[PDB]
Paper text:
The bifunctional dehydrogenase/isomerase FabX is an essential UFA biosynthesis enzyme in the widespread human pathogen Helicobacter pylori, a bacterium etiologically related to 95% of gastric cancers. FabX belongs to the nitronate monooxygenase (NMO) flavoprotein family but contains an atypical [4Fe-4S] cluster absent in all other family members characterized to date. We demonstrate that the [4Fe–4S] cluster functions as a temporary electron depot that receives electrons from FMN and sends electrons back to FMN to achieve independent bidirectional internal electron transfer.
Author numbering:
A (entry chain A): -2 to 363
B (entry chain B): 1 to 72
Write the structure that this text describes.
Amino acid sequence: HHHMVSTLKPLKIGKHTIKFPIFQGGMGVGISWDELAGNVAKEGALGVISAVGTGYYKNMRFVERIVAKKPFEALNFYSKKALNEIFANARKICGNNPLGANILYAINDYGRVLRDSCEAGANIIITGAGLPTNMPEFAKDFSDVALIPIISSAKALKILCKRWSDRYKRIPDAFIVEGPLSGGHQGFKYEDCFKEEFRLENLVPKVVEASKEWGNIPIIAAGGIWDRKDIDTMLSLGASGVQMATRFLGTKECDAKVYADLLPTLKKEDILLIKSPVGYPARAINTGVIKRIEEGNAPKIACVSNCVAPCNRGEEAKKVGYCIADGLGRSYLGNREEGLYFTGANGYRVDKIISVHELIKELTEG
Amino acid sequence: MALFEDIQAVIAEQLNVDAAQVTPEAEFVKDLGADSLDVVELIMALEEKFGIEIPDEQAEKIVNVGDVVKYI
Ligand SMILES: Cc1cc2nc3c(=O)[nH]c(=O)nc-3n(C[C@H](O)[C@H](O)[C@H](O)COP(=O)(O)O)c2cc1C
Ligand SMILES: *P(=O)(O)OCC(C)(C)[C@@H](O)C(=O)NCCC(=O)NCCSC(=O)CCCCCCC
Ligand code: SF4
């Protein structure tokens, strides 16, 4: 009955080592902030602070211009002042244990947020939602920060390794392979998703194989990993580590407190793949804005935050039906009628909300 | 004119589209059906055949073929 020690081996990424080979995946807006990532880091996995939509922190406490009760422009949505505080509050819990920062490549002011993230104290930058071909350019003042792109194919690894070496004579410290069972935006063919070929058990061998040709870059598997059995599967397929989000989405320390009420009711029939202004399919919960759209009751779209470049300030949001900055922003603020809510495909299995410590114990024991 | 047709033949070959529809107004993604991976590849293919770099801060601004042509 006593807590039991792990046979999982510590994981080292660039200059930093974590006691368990486990990333807590970044989750915006306001989902994996100070409480969640600080406690994860306390417990020996990687805590990952999402840096998207930080102006919403402490009800826009740190914004300097508000329009329609929404942070005005990327300068306020991606708040340097808010992001420093979250890192400050995260280090209270975790000390100098390693903390990641997650930044979609799609966002406006990408370069500024990466340096804000380094200056905030981040040890690792994680970037998906695009092919981050210039990521070392913005980190050049911070040779200690490891850089980890998210990819969904071996082709993307080859492409990024070629560009980074051509341009910078540098190579990514790790890659996260994200499969189609993941939450949020998919790195997959709008259409494909359930094809056998794209299954995470198949991608990870292919990416690890390709990764050998570039000095054995550590490959972190993500998407649908639920328990220690899933973890062992991915490690046996060549992965050095796993990234997991939905299980941590169902913990008490999750900074987006609404998810503790929502997830125990979630049924598989209410998990759906939707369109997004970011340009990728997104895995969402059929609730909030998504219901308001189907009702014909959807909130008005008027681009204030200008969160991501592919949207062209309303063009893609008006065509899909929702503003993703406003929808995720409202969720952090508790708005259940017109918030936007994401989940991985496994979210319906979240029956009880447990603590980070209890989750970490389940995954590492033995 | 000599430049435009050289980079026209490269775009047509990379994206597997007819050169005749690789027109200065044609957008690589909307009009020519390419994704992100295709565009980076195309940018790399152009860099070799012409020995320039096209930093990402301009590549983010080019969007159609005519803008690519001017940058070169
Ligand atoms: C609610 C939610 C929000 C997410 N937001 C982001 C994000 O902002 N940036 C990112 O790279 N991935 C995001 N993801 C993806 C996760 O970080 C992770 O890669 C994926 O969910 C892992 O699969 P799992 O949820 O099945 O464990 C999000 C996932 C969820 C569930
Ligand atoms: P290109 O068309 O742009 O193609 C790029 C491509 C193929 C998607 C690659 O970048 C790739 O392989 N990507 C994997 C990236 C990811 O899969 N995932 C990270 C996505 S960010 C995210 O999931 C959700 C963000 C939730 C918050 C939105 C905040 C405003
Ligand atoms: S309208 Fe588009 S760019 Fe503006 S905040 Fe919403 S999703 Fe972001």
